[PDB]
Ligand binder design. Structure first.
Ligand SMILES: [Mg+2]
Ligand SMILES: [Mg+2]
Ligand SMILES: [Mg+2]
Ligand SMILES: [Mg+2]
Ligand SMILES: [Mg+2]
Ligand SMILES: [Mg+2]
Ligand SMILES: [Mg+2]
Ligand SMILES: [Mg+2]
Ligand SMILES: [Mg+2]
Ligand SMILES: [Mg+2]
Ligand SMILES: [Mg+2]
Ligand SMILES: [Mg+2]
Ligand SMILES: [Mg+2]
Ligand SMILES: [Mg+2]
Ligand SMILES: [Mg+2]
Ligand SMILES: [Mg+2]
Ligand SMILES: [Mg+2]
Ligand SMILES: [Mg+2]
Ligand SMILES: [Mg+2]
Ligand SMILES: [Mg+2]
Ligand SMILES: [Mg+2]
Ligand SMILES: [Mg+2]
Ligand SMILES: [Mg+2]
Ligand SMILES: [Mg+2]
Ligand SMILES: [Mg+2]
Ligand SMILES: [Mg+2]
Ligand SMILES: [Mg+2]
Ligand SMILES: [Mg+2]
Ligand SMILES: [Mg+2]
Ligand SMILES: [Mg+2]
Ligand SMILES: [Mg+2]
Ligand SMILES: [Mg+2]
Ligand SMILES: [Mg+2]
Ligand SMILES: [Mg+2]
Ligand SMILES: [Mg+2]
Ligand SMILES: [Mg+2]
Ligand SMILES: [Mg+2]
Ligand SMILES: [Mg+2]
Ligand SMILES: [Mg+2]
Ligand SMILES: [Mg+2]
Ligand SMILES: [Mg+2]
Ligand SMILES: [Mg+2]
Ligand SMILES: [Mg+2]
Ligand SMILES: [Mg+2]
Lengths: 50, 75, 61
RNA sequence: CUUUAAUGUUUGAUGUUCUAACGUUGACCCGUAAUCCGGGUUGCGGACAGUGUCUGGUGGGUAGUUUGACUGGGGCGGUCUCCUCCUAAAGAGUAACGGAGGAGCACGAAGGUUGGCUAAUCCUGGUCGGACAUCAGGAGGUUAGUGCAAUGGCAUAAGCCAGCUUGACUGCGAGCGUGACGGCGCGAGCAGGUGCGAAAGCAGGUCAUAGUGAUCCGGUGGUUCUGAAUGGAAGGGCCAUC
RNA sequence: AAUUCCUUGUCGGGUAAGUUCCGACCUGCACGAAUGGCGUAAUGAUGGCCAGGCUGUCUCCACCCGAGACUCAGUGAAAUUGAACUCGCUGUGAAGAUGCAGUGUACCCGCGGCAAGACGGAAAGACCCCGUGAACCUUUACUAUAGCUUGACACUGAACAU
RNA sequence: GUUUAUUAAAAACACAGCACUGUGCAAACACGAAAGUGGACGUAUACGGUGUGACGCCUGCCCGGUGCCGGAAGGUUAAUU
RNA sequence: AGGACCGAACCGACUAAUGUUGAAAAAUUAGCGGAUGACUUGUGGCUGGGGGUGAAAGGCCAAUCAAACCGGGAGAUAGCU
RNA sequence: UUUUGUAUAAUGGGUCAGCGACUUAUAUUCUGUAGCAAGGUUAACCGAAUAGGGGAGCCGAAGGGAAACCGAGUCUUAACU
RNA sequence: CCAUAGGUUAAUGAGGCGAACCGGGGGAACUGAAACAUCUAAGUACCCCGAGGAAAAGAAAUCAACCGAGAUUCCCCCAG
């Protein structure tokens, strides 16, 4: 798998991730993204792919 | 080996001038902006020109570059 | 000899009030991340059985 | 806790001796005027061999099955899904082993927004410097670019630069289109809640059209669901996903 | 050449003339040494070639003897058969005509013959294709299995040393 | 000499000779789930399997592949515990 | 003495013709090979179908053989006629 | 009969006469008709046996949701006009 | 050596035939799935053993749900 499928786990106390695709040979770093989380229904920073 | 073709995508004008249409009715499925958005018309992300209010459909020809616009009348 | 039931159709269907049957959309057990949330939000509820297929459901009942 | 001794210790592995289970298509006796069989004496092996159960390898010796379709007869050759143009006779659609090409990917920016800019090619002058690198001016004015094949489109730029950023958010959907169907696609607008801009406003991914896989079966996370007497649990469902 | 596509390879022989045959040459498409190689006396209802004798094989058939075929009397079948008052020619046509069109010819019926046609009769084409048909057969096709083989446990013990 | 009784009698089979190989007897091998037989009332000068098929000159090279023979250092490895 | 030679019965079936609704569901006529051998023959036993047997052709196993015949599953299935 | 199409030289039939090919049982749905009617109706069984009991049960009047659960409403959603 | 094995005699019982129904020991394939191997067809067809006018099973180490029912076999519903 060249471009590989990963997820975006919320840093809150909520068991929710989004899901997207990353590459290996372009990004050695993990992905930080602010995103909505429908438990507290606000926007939380996301990290921890897979 | 040369013969091949896609499935045709059913483009064109679905509703012509002089027709009482309803809201959100698709008028034109086109690729580019060969038909241009205008009064009461949204341009889709595939440039599907879609309607916003009830009424008729009028093909105006306006603009400095002789473009083709679609509009919805009321009366 | 009573009629045998198509058990797959009995699992995938259930009857509504005016004789229509209900069913559940496809494309919802695996690959979902390359798809859109708009598409999956369309797919998530249940719907009615279409026109030409009612004979091929009622015969299965 | 590192490496090793005296000896209790449950047993496993190697060699040696014994005979008593087991074998004897060695001998002798009896039933018995009998080359089967049984019983006894005796000899040689002897915990080996061999039989059953489980398991690994072999296994056409043998049994049951498969080996596709289009096709200008069949087979070999080629092709089967998706996108683009023509054949398409100016609504949509329209076949052929008709003519020509591409896709089974990519991006944390190449996305959103705000502010802003406009390319190709040629000529002239200019150190190494060259037919062509980087500078300045002129003609020209999209021939260039648009992540890629083609077509349509783009100057209010959909092409290019920088800052700020996560709307590549969720739950819904009046209505429409296109397919027999499963489905696929466009979508103003509502509630919540973000980013950009002073604001009017824009943003539910990329300029669009390909970049894909039904169901079943099972994996992981969450759960105002169920829980075969009851409370739990295993499992089943639902939501998300592999 | 039991093997050579081109090929009747090329050169001698035989013959008036020989794609076959015999002898030799090598450029063996693609002989080859135990799925043997090369020679071989004899043997072969074996394959090929030549020569003498011999003759109706032939030019070119002719005559004769018997058994049928023909006639008389007696017994008396069969396959096939939509129906029939069942001609030719040219043309048309499900595309090769007894039947259609046009035209020619022809008193009605036996008998002996000959087979050119009636796409004649016999067997629902064996070769061709299709059916998601069958049978057998082969293998490093798949799935299993009898069998061969390995080990553990039970049938199964007593002591000695490591 | 044998063969397709019935479209094929041959160059096909078989042969004696040859070589490889399995074989220690309760042999290998075969029928048979076992018993018991054939092997043979034989005993490596015997029996089976396999190819070539009298005789004479002979029979060359290769263990890369597939199959057979030898082993017991190492890796991996079933059931059991 | 000879799987010796010629040739009767005996065994077989290489060539031509007739026959091909026949005299005959494979013959007749005229020729033909072996004829003391691995032959021929009378009688009776043994081998039962995924089996036998086969000097091997896929030949024979009751006029039927790439798996006999009979009775069953059986009104097998038949997108074919 | 099969066909795009047959006088077709594509198939089948020599002729007559007899026989011969969409039936049966239990389920479901639709139509027509008869009864009753927010009701309808029994089956197995008892029974001077088509009567009459027997109403165990099935269908219908209320659905929605996977389900707990609610109810002329129900499901999604924190929540809908 | 006793005794067992064995030999003789004698009595009682059995053998075998028969349609189907029954209890068991063995046990296919065509077919269907539009092919086929899991599955089916079915423990059907078939082979074998044994008894009776009936056979087998049969008085609970069975169900249910905190109320309880009370051996076995047969029919109708639950229920396609
Ligand atoms: Mg309806
Ligand atoms: Mg799912
Ligand atoms: Mg096979
Ligand atoms: Mg089978
Ligand atoms: Mg094909
Ligand atoms: Mg037109
Ligand atoms: Mg068009
Ligand atoms: Mg701007
Ligand atoms: Mg769960
Ligand atoms: Mg329980
Ligand atoms: Mg020669
Ligand atoms: Mg010459
Ligand atoms: Mg050779
Ligand atoms: Mg030879
Ligand atoms: Mg001979
Ligand atoms: Mg006439
Ligand atoms: Mg003519
Ligand atoms: Mg004649
Ligand atoms: Mg004919
Ligand atoms: Mg036929
Ligand atoms: Mg045929
Ligand atoms: Mg013959
Ligand atoms: Mg012959
Ligand atoms: Mg030979
Ligand atoms: Mg050699
Ligand atoms: Mg002789
Ligand atoms: Mg002689
Ligand atoms: Mg042969
Ligand atoms: Mg052959
Ligand atoms: Mg025969
Ligand atoms: Mg067979
Ligand atoms: Mg049957
Ligand atoms: Mg039949
Ligand atoms: Mg036909
Ligand atoms: Mg027709
Ligand atoms: Mg006509
Ligand atoms: Mg005719
Ligand atoms: Mg005809
Ligand atoms: Mg006929
Ligand atoms: Mg009649
Ligand atoms: Mg009554
Ligand atoms: Mg099938
Ligand atoms: Mg009893
Ligand atoms: Mg109690």
């Amino acid at each position: 798998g060249i471009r590989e499928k990963i997820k975006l786990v919320s840093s809150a106390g909520t068991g929710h991730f989004y899901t997207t695709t990353k590459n290996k040979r372009t990004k050695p770093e993990k992905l930080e993204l602010k995103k909505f989380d429908p438990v507290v229904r606000q926007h939380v920073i996301y990290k921890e792919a897979k | 080996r040369n013969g091949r073709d896609s499935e045709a995508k059913r483009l064109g004008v679905k509703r012509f001038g002089g027709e009482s249409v309803l809201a959100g009715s698709i008028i034109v499925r086109q690729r580019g902006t060969k038909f241009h958005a205008g009064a009461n018309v949204g341009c889709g992300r595939d440039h599907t020109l879609f309607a916003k209010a009830d009424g008729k459909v009028k093909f105006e020809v306006k603009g400095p570059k002789n473009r083709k616009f679609i509009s919805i009348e009321a009366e | 000899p009573k009629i045998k039931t198509v058990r797959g159709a009995a699992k995938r269907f259930k009857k509504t009030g005016k004789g229509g049957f209900k069913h559940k959309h496809a494309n919802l057990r695996h690959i979902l991340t390359k798809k859109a949330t708009k598409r999956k939000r369309h797919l998530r509820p249940k719907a009615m059985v279409s026109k030409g297929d009612l004979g091929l459901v009622i015969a299965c009942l």
